[PDB]
Design a protein around this ligand. Structure first.
Ligand SMILES: C=C(NCc1c(COP(=O)(O)O)cnc(C)c1O)C(=O)O
Ligand SMILES: C=C(NCc1c(COP(=O)(O)O)cnc(C)c1O)C(=O)O
Ligand SMILES: C=C(NCc1c(COP(=O)(O)O)cnc(C)c1O)C(=O)O
Ligand SMILES: C=C(NCc1c(COP(=O)(O)O)cnc(C)c1O)C(=O)O
Lengths: 389, 390, 389, 389
């Protein structure tokens, strides 16, 4: 009962930006152009490229593809997901206010809380999953609302169309949705009212655990020109090879995400059936408080499964150490299955008190279910939970 | 009469951070580690690496090498030179003031003037080549002094130790020297009092016109920890492959820069003796107003040659179009020779009024002399100058 | 009614040879080791590597993975598919005989006929699809039988178990199966009696149209030692980067091949019911003469679809140029859909007389169906066939 | 008093094949084109590229550059130096004869001796440094003469122009010069009568110890077409990235080779004056038996320094081991200094009887002097010789 899948997604992921007529050789795969500079027929009159930081063939090809997958007009690539957040923040000026989602990636919390706040910006963390709390927190100085859905790691879900309703009542407020967890194959924030669709491409977009990159998709002409200026002026740009490698991962995004769905759902149901699991948070399960909201704004779910182990910190540790197929490591969205304890690793940059209020306890385990065989993944979780029973 | 060359430079550029025993294969060249994450034996108990953005083998190898070449204790790599400038600015707080050299790369001027100033920072452009003009502009809110030497493109030279004397006289003020034009083989700002040695690694460090990268070297422990926090928190980090490629270019930095010196000097002398060149700005020529300061502050000179062609824009254009070996393009520091007209291209982001005050006119041409054969470079300039003045 | 899928394929494709414990950094993805040489603890006493051509970390990791996907003990990577064919041919001696499948890739035909024959080797092309023709052609000097199944481009299918029975009655004959068209996810020649499972990894193994590489899997110890000697001695070795890129593509082989199956079947059925197609050759259709052998010998089929257009050379040409999503080009097995005219392009190296005997006519069109959206692929073929008629 | 340096060498190494107008972007550095295939406007009507193995932009750019540096009309790149040797051998036919230099790289001797000889080719090893023995050994079946100069590792020098005179009196005999040790910056075999200038590009050509590659430069039109046919037909082709990396190393060949000369000479003079060195073989020293011949055909010398340690095998082992800056490893020609004992390491593939007759004894040490600071390289040799006395 999910949203119908996006129509030409697979065809566009393979061909947008990959036109052979772009190259003299008519190659079917875009070449990796490392050249920092380009010949000009006259001072200031180039043939499309002046300097790699401002633009280069391999990066523009990637931006073209991601924009199409997001239903966007424009896209911008950056050195990392955080670098995209920083560049987006530079759209503002001293005196502006930012409303940020309550549960967000540790680095996003760390940046807003400890860095951006020191340059004339007020940061307010609000649980926008309760949509009235967002409306109450908006102020005449609010210029940017930063949303994750599902949130990392508690996986709270936010009505994007509802928030866009509210946020756009006050005129000039930018709504950003960090769509890293879902990918554009399952959720298109721009089609739901958002002004900016942002990704940590390190996770699902690239999907091969070998490229650190951020992506930002936008439709507004004014908003794109401002973001493009900061891409060149701040210089947090990605390598053209990383762009090629990321564009390479997009070619299989559709088949990868579909398998993440099946394996993730199978893992979530198994964990809810386990006598040694206290709670399971997965947007695809009916037990999720926003399950029905997911189906109206998403075409499916991913392999990100969060759950609470029964017991204490030492039971969580024992489970993670007895894993033989899941790998104890940070990050997510790759072909290999990964397991982690956010309170001690990825979300240790969040204040401990803020962890407790959010539920990020010592027993919260986050899983990034990969593309391995289903029964092998379930046999690994079973043996490791039994080890920690 | 230049400074004696820095000892062990070549050996360190080839071996620092390149320890074969680091790898199970015991390879002599460090592998390219693309992995975004690393397996941990226990929650939070890694093997040296947690996440690629925080750190990764190939990037750490590069940073160590640069640190040794700069005589620094630590170094940080970034996605670009500007990204290093932005990260350095984030060391400050709203209300602080930045003093920037009046003549600087257009993008540096653009960032400070149009971006950093909008976040509670006041920017003042002052001619720190006159070292007393800097002393007058310092205020209790001054936290950062950003200088280029030689400046881009006018190539004004600044007594780094002189500025360091003044700057450190007022307590907690950071002195940054953008050492892009000279490279550590010819100038070590840290040994001259500077607090931060910063590079656009896109130019000479990599030296192969195929990597966009910035580098920041530092000695102060407090200053390093704050920069490292911002490297991971702002995430303007370079690709591990770019890190490998840049470390690859470092291996020939010493032999590349020496040839840049010879070709650059030969081009400057040819242009100075040319009847259709009004003036030549090259730190290696005695005609440069700060020549003796250069020999006092550098072990040599670079391939960056600036000069004024005789006539008007119309002659500047024609000269550039008749070039057959020099390439009309932006950037610099590569093995290939490059020519440009800053007022319209790299420094078009600078306001015309400040361009005029700085001397960046329609006849100022900037050359990045490459590693081609000397005779071919001089014949291309000769043929192009004659073409512009028949 | 196909063979049941191979157990643990996906798990092995993602993890075999990728153990993080190999690296000091504990990286989850193997690094790309470009170093040509390695430090030795003593003159001639290495720690596993002395020189890149003999072996290097990134290549050895890939070989382990491919061997597992083939169920093999050993695997060897090469600079190209032909480079693997040449290296295998060097296993023999002057005076030996080679029996090659009559319908084979043009370059493979060119090598045996025009090169290997000039160095004391007798080459015999036999229709091994009739198993008695192989038995009749075996000679006391026969040392190598080289088979493709399905063949390129006519896609004749060969009973691997039948040929192994025949070939191995005579003692010292090597049976090679070029498994390029099927990939190890759908066909395991080694489990069916073959002595060597060989691939042009340029096609499906890498699957991203950006790596030229060959792979050879083997079980026999004597046969492996002889091949390993020639890998280092002939030096037709691949770059460690290409090895990394190919190993990256292997991680999604299972999900890619499943989509190739679905898209290939849909395209093959559409063409067979098309009024401007005289004949369709697809192992997955019941109309294929060896359909029942395919289901007995394969777990599925791929996106390689061959068909004869009705009319003349001019109708094939017009059809091929009016394709707007399929790309007219050589090669196959990538995420993008490809079309070609073998008689003029990939198989122009086969003698015209031999083309007619094999059926490689001016109206035979070969398709490599990619992973694009199904309806877009069928709509591109529909509009292009009308354009020709 | 050497030959004058080759004119326009540096300019050509930086610009030949690197023309920005080749690319729509007008990039100053050629892009890395990984695409295996290319779009064709009509069946068999390409725009210069059909399939990566036959040709691709990044490889063709490299081939143009090397050809110019060799003073050649054509150049062909291969997966390795041995792969280039194999491809050149396939130029012949069963019944032909090969004359190979008596002292040659272990792998080159091993290939001819143990592989090529098994396919209807007779191999004859002759000391062509004494030119009368070459004239005597030629036979009506001789079709190819293969020389190294300086030889590896004894570094005997061969009058290339003299041998070309002899071999070309007998009509259709190919003269190959493996110019690996000298690089085209110091020796141009083609300008001295050779028919083929061949390189192991892994050594000085690339010069960064991270690319395994072979190169062959030729002037004869018939000979080039035959080699080009075999490049595509045997498929021992290099990766396009390796081609880019090798072309990148070429840009600094001139400045690298000059420093190898200076450091090599200083090391050769130091070791010859060292009380615990029995002999020093360096083409640049007056003590070299063919020193005056070197100055006749070369513009300079390299960092390859061979010498005999005074004493026994055990002193050579200890010497290699106490080096703290030189690295004990195989290969040569990189920016880093390398030490090895060929009799057991690189030349262990040569038969002992042939080793003893050639002088490759247990006390012969081969050094590849890098680009490190001269004074540090000389104490590394000083301290290590002191330790072994
Ligand atoms: C590091 C992981 N996430 C980083 C992240 C980021 C930051 O992306 P970077 O590529 O690490 O800069 C942004 N958005 C979301 C939703 C994220 O989860 C993690 O949770 O392991
Ligand atoms: C692009 C040019 N310079 C960039 C530059 C930079 C910026 O570096 P990037 O890597 O391009 O971000 C910093 N410092 C100096 C002295 C510079 O010249 C140029 O002058 O052509
Ligand atoms: C080039 C295509 N085939 C190459 C090929 C090869 C040659 O592999 P290469 O890696 O392309 O050299 C071997 N075996 C089969 C079955 C093949 O199809 C083609 O038909 O377009
Ligand atoms: C491996 C070294 N030489 C390889 C070599 C080769 C073999 O080339 P490869 O690229 O290593 O396959 C060919 N010719 C000469 C003169 C060589 O020296 C060595 O001596 O360590």
């Amino acid at each position: 009962g999910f949203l119908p899948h996006f129509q030409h997604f697979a065809t566009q992921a393979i061909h947008v930006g990959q036109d052979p007529e772009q190259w003299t050789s008519r190659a079917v795969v875009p070449p990796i152009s490392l050249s920092t500079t380009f010949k000009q027929g006259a001072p200031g009159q180039h043939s499309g490229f002046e300097y790699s930081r401002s633009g280069n063939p391999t990066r523009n090809c990637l931006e073209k593809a991601v924009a199409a997958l997001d239903g966007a007009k424009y896209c911008l690539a950056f050195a990392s997901g955080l670098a995209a957040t920083v560049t987006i923040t530079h759209l503002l000026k001293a005196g502006d206010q930012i409303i940020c989602m309550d549960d967000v990636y540790g680095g996003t919390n760390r940046y807003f809380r400890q860095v951006a706040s020191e340059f004339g910006l007020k940061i307010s963390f609000v649980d926008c999953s309760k949509i009235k709390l967002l409306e109450a927190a908006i102020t005449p100085e609010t210029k940017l609302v930063w949303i994750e859905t599902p949130t990392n790691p508690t996986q709270k879900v936010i009505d994007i169309e509802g928030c866009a309703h509210i946020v756009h009542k006050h005129g000039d407020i930018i709504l950003v949705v960090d769509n890293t967890f879902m990918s554009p194959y399952f959720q298109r924030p721009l089609a739901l009212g958002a002004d900016i669709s942002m990704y940590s491409a390190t996770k699902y977009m690239n999907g091969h655990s070998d490229v650190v990159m951020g992506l930002v998709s936008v439709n507004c002409e004014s908003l794109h020109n401002r973001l493009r200026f900061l891409q060149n002026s701040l210089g947090a740009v990605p390598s053209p090879i990383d762009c090629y490698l990321c564009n390479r991962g997009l070619k299989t995004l559709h088949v990868r995400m579909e398998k993440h769905f099946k394996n993730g759902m199978a893992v979530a149901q198994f964990l809810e059936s386990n006598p040694w699991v206290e709670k399971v948070i997965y947007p695809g399960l009916p037990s999720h408080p926003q399950h029905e909201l997911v189906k109206r704004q998403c075409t499916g779910c991913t392999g990100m499964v969060t759950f609470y182990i029964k017991g204490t910190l030492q039971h969580a540790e024992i489970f993670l150490k007895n894993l033989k197929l899941f790998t104890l490591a940070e990050s997510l969205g790759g072909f290999e299955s990964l397991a982690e304890l956010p309170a001690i690793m990825t979300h240790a940059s969040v204040l401990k008190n803020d962890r407790d209020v959010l539920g990020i306890s010592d027993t919260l385990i986050r899983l990034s279910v990969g593309l391995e065989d289903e029964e092998d993944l379930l046999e690994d979780l079973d043996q490791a939970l039994k080890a920690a029973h």
